[PDB]
Design a protein around this ligand. Structure first.
Ligand SMILES: *C1O[C@H](CO[C@@H]2O[C@@H](C)[C@@H](O)[C@@H](O)[C@@H]2O)[C@@H](O[C@@H]2O[C@H](CO)[C@@H](O)[C@H](O)[C@H]2NC(C)=O)[C@H](O)[C@H]1NC(C)=O
Ligand SMILES: *[C@@H]1O[C@H](CO[C@@H]2O[C@@H](C)[C@@H](O)[C@@H](O)[C@@H]2O)[C@@H](O[C@@H]2O[C@H](CO)[C@@H](O)[C@H](O)[C@H]2NC(C)=O)[C@H](O)[C@H]1NC(C)=O
Ligand SMILES: *[C@@H]1O[C@H](CO[C@H]2O[C@@H](C)[C@@H](O)[C@@H](O)[C@@H]2O)[C@@H](O[C@@H]2O[C@H](CO)[C@@H](O)[C@H](O)[C@H]2NC(C)=O)[C@H](O)[C@H]1NC(C)=O
Ligand SMILES: COCCN(C[C@@H]1CCCN(Cc2ccccc2)C1)S(=O)(=O)c1ccc2ccccc2c1
Ligand SMILES: *[C@@H]1O[C@H](CO)[C@@H](O[C@@H]2O[C@H](CO)[C@@H](O)[C@H](O)[C@H]2NC(C)=O)[C@H](O)[C@H]1NC(C)=O
Ligand SMILES: *[C@@H]1O[C@H](CO)[C@@H](O[C@@H]2O[C@H](CO)[C@@H](O)[C@H](O)[C@H]2NC(C)=O)[C@H](O)[C@H]1NC(C)=O
Ligand SMILES: *[C@@H]1O[C@H](CO)[C@@H](O[C@H]2O[C@H](CO)[C@@H](O)[C@H](O)[C@H]2NC(C)=O)[C@H](O)[C@H]1NC(C)=O
Ligand SMILES: *[C@H]1O[C@H](CO)[C@@H](O)[C@H](O)[C@H]1NC(C)=O
Ligand SMILES: [Cl-]
Ligand SMILES: [Cl-]
Length: 527
């Protein structure tokens, strides 16, 4: 039998045959009390015990969330939709262990993204058996509440204080600290890693004092808290809570009555109203996400980062070459995943209004000016490409770079990557390039599965990324080998060196997109 004793009871695993070896998987370990009934909107409560041997042999329920149904049958979007029953009873986690069982393995904890409204640990691109098999690390991933059920905020009120999903993550980090040694793992070697909102989440755990001792090191893939979508101000969050009460028939004299009313609502009644809590939106809208709750976050995160009030440790940060394109076919006029999406200069300008609703006309004018200095005047795909880069630079690349600069300025080693390979199996059209989220499958080592129809070059690339991530986790240094390996230099605010990741060559380069990002940090805010 495959049985591990944990502080909350014994749990039964299952064997996976991986690359002619065995990985032991414990899928769907509860780590918190089910946030049902009176526990809805509260911080997660510690788990006491489950009754008998818990069978962690199938993934757990995913947290409640609206589904992306924009493209029925399309793998490109359905690969992100939850693949287990949705339920409010979702606070579970997964643990993959190398066989034979390690004595003190480094632990990698995955935090999925999904704009704080979606995601689940059970997606196939987050399958952790490959990393455990190939690098002999332990992999943990957890489900955390998303949407209003996860980030409804009445700051100061324990009935709905804000940042519950972040606290879900945190409680799972505490569970690893309490229990991972029984799975053979080193609680003193724990690396958080995640993508998009998960990366924004990792970046917020660097700032949260309660998480300081729950992990060693941090990997931020295509995301950071200073991205414009990631953190809502204290009273912007409160306002949206009130509007949800309004929209559901739960407006009440005092706040606890409002929360009382919202606990009576069906989950679908909450989920289907989440989109209407803001006056206007964008394809990158986070209606209920992290906020300044005074508990998980004691000040605006921008300030804590400025003042060095964060966990002093090593980080690995990076972005993808076409972060913006994904969001274009979700509300930008003239953009379809089924044509080559050539757009006019007028369609570009309409896209700016879609993605920048509350920005002045001269604000849009200067965005347009900064992104039209064409190398070749036509080149009929200039505006199509300009709009992607605007969305990608403003929402992801430039914030990730600025976070890395300011963080490295306080003395810890920081490593930046620019991932430029488009997957041979990427189901979206070619014009969308190296999309948001499509480095993940390489990080988790799926190209290592030869029966899966990736190219040999993608196996080598994924094998190299898998080595660097695991080496970063074990050693604070994302090295590959000492010899025959391009060195990954530290990111330093003067030189700002980064490593490119693709199949042709991995080069050290400097000041990624500095001319574009300089616009977004030092001019656009003044507008
Ligand atoms: C806080 O937010 C409200 C927005 O409230 C609205 O009502 C909700 C039910 C929801 O459906 C939203 O889409 C609505 O926008 C701000 O009030 C606005 O002013 C009036 C008051 O109802 C409303 O008709 C307007 O549409 C809102 N403004 C815009 C630009 O749409 C309110 O000002 C915000 N700030 C504070 C401090 O409360
Ligand atoms: C977890 O599953 C066990 C049974 O699953 C199997 O039995 C194990 C001994 C092992 O051989 C596994 O590989 C099998 O998949 C549940 O066990 C109870 O006890 C016996 C076990 O065979 C069974 O006849 C009983 O009917 C089970 N009890 C009940 C009330 O039906 C065990 O209950 C499962 N754990 C939980 C928390 O449900
Ligand atoms: C040592 O291995 C190289 C490949 O190693 C490349 O990996 C990158 C991450 C980076 O660190 C880089 O400096 C490093 O060189 C081998 O070259 C590969 O060789 C095959 C042929 O066997 C070519 O088809 C590949 O294109 C080539 N990859 C490259 C150049 O990136 C090579 O076998 C070996 N070189 C020596 C001198 O021993
Ligand atoms: C179901 O509820 C709708 C809300 N969003 C739907 C999104 C819209 C855009 C993309 N996809 C994911 C996707 C598709 C294809 C390739 C890669 C990635 C579906 S969301 O909750 O998922 C969302 C919101 C705001 C984000 C802000 C920053 C980054 C990601 C965000 C995701
Ligand atoms: C689950 O995987 C473990 C690890 O591979 C298996 O345990 C091994 O089985 C072989 C075959 O007899 C032994 O030589 C090893 O000594 C075993 N290891 C341990 C730690 O006991 C186990 O058999 C698998 N469970 C299954 C297949 O149900
Ligand atoms: C990558 O670099 C790190 C150093 O940054 C190497 O780490 C040492 O690793 C060995 C394991 O072989 C440990 O026993 C030492 O204690 C480590 N020392 C230090 C100072 O880190 C690591 O070996 C390198 N790996 C490769 C493949 O190059
Ligand atoms: C696993 O590795 C840790 C270190 O990462 C070992 O911890 C001990 O040694 C550490 C020095 O690096 C310190 O944290 C402590 O001196 C000590 N830990 C204590 C006393 O709690 C740990 O022993 C290793 N576990 C193994 C090998 O099973
Ligand atoms: C493709 O996308 C939509 C079709 O649904 C359309 O509005 C747009 O103009 C089309 N662009 C083409 C065909 O170039
Ligand atoms: Cl995502
Ligand atoms: Cl093209």
């Amino acid at each position: 039998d495959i049985i591990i004793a944990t502080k909350n009871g014994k749990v039964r695993g299952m064997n996976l045959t991986v690359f002619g070896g065995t990985v032991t998987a414990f899928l769907g370990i509860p780590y918190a009390q089910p946030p049902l009934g009176r526990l809805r909107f509260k911080k997660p409560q510690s788990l006491t015990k489950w009754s008998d041997i818990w069978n962690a042999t199938k993934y757990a329920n995913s947290c409640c969330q609206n589904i992306d149904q924009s493209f029925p049958g399309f793998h490109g979007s359905e690969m992100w939709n939850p693949n287990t029953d949705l339920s409010e009873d979702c606070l579970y986690l997964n643990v993959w262990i190398p066989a034979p069982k390690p004595k003190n393995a480094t632990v990698l904890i995955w935090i999925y993204g999904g704009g704080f409204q979606t995601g689940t640990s059970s997606l196939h691109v987050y399958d952790g058996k490959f990393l455990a098999r190939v690098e002999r690390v332990i992999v943990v991933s957890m489900n955390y509440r998303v949407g209003a059920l996860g980030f409804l905020a009445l700051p100061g009120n324990p009935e709905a204080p804000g940042n519950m999903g972040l606290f879900d993550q945190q409680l799972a980090l505490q569970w690893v600290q309490k229990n991972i040694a029984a799975f053979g793992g080193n609680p003193k070697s724990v690396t958080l890693f995640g993508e998009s909102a998960g990366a924004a989440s990792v970046s917020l755990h660097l700032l949260s004092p309660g998480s300081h001792s729950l992990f060693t090191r941090a990997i931020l893939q295509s995301g950071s808290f200073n991205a414009p979508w990631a953190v809502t101000s204290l009273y912007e969050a409160r306002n949206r809570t009130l509007n949800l009460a309004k929209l559901t028939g739960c407006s009440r004299e005092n706040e606890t009555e409002i929360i009382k009313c919202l606990r009576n609502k069906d989950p679908q009644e909450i989920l289907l109203n989440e989109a209407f809590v803001v006056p206007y939106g964008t394809p990158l809208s986070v209606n209920f996400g992290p906020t300044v709750d005074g508990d998980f976050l004691t000040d605006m995160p921008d300030i804590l980062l400025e003042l060095g009030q964060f966990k002093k440790t090593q980080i690995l940060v990076g972005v993808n070459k076409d972060e913006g394109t994904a969001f274009l076919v979700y509300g930008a006029p003239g953009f379809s995943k089924d044509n080559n999406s050539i757009i006019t200069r007028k369609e570009f300008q309409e896209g700016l209004k879609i993605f920048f609703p509350g920005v002045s006309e001269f604000g849009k004018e200067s965005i347009l000016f900064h992104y039209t200095d064409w190398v070749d005047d036509q080149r009929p795909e200039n505006y199509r490409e300009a709009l992607g880069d605007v969305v990608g630079d403003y929402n992801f690349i430039c914030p990730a770079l600025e976070f890395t600069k300011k963080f490295s300025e306080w003395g810890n080693n920081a490593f930046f990557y620019y991932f430029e390979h488009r997957s041979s199996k990427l189901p979206w059209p070619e014009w969308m390039g190296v999309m948001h989220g499509y480095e993940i499958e390489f990080v988790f080592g799926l190209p290592l599965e030869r029966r899966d129809n990736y190219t040999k070059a993608e196996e080598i690339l994924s094998r190299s990324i898998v080595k660097r991530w695991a080496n970063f986790a074990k050693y604070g240094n994302p090295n590959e080998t000492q010899n025959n390996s391009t060195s990954w230099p530290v990111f330093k605010s003067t030189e700002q060196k980064y490593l490119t990741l693709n199949t042709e060559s991995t080069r050290i380069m400097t000041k990624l997109r500095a001319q574009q990002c300089r616009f977004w940090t030092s001019f656009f805010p003044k507008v």
